[PDB]
């Protein structure tokens, strides 16, 4: 299509951070299934592994393991 568009869409099978309904804190999770309507979605919390209905506007994309190897030692003893 066209490259160069701001935005972010969720999908069933992506790890994300959802705000607990009892802690209201950002915790790890995974988009279990979105809602036809397009407002809330079922996300599974890793903390225990239970599903919770949270809004899409209350979810954040989890960073990826962009590790980098190199023969040059980076961090050292302080």
UniProtKB/Swiss-Prot annotation:
Annotated protein name in UniProt: Tudor domain-containing protein 3
Assembly mode: Component of mRNA stress granules. Interacts with FMR1, FXR1, FXR2, EWSR1, FUS, SERBP1, EEF1A1 and DDX3X or DDX3Y, and with the small nuclear ribonucleoprotein-associated proteins SNRPB and SNRPN. Interacts with 'Lys-48'-linked tetra-ubiquitin, but not with monoubiquitin or 'Lys-63'-linked ubiquitin chains. May interact with the exon junction complex (EJC) composed at least of CASC3, EIF4A3, MAGOH and RBM8A. Interacts with POLR2A (via the C-terminal domain (CTD)).
Boundaries of the shown chain within the full protein: 646 to 705 of 743
Cellular localization per UniProt: Cytoplasm; Nucleus
Organism from which the protein derives: Mus musculus
Domain Tudor: 9-67
Gene (UniProt): Tdrd3
Domain of life, source organism: Eukaryota
Domain notes: The Tudor domain specifically recognizes and binds asymmetric dimethylation of histone H3 'Arg-17' (H3R17me2a) and histones H4 'Arg-3', 2 tags for epigenetic transcriptional activation.
Function: Scaffolding protein that specifically recognizes and binds dimethylarginine-containing proteins. Plays a role in the regulation of translation of target mRNAs by binding Arg/Gly-rich motifs (GAR) in dimethylarginine-containing proteins. In nucleus, acts as a coactivator: recognizes and binds asymmetric dimethylation on the core histone tails associated with transcriptional activation (H3R17me2a and H4R3me2a) and recruits proteins at these arginine-methylated loci. In cytoplasm, acts as an antiviral factor that participates in the assembly of stress granules together with G3BP1.
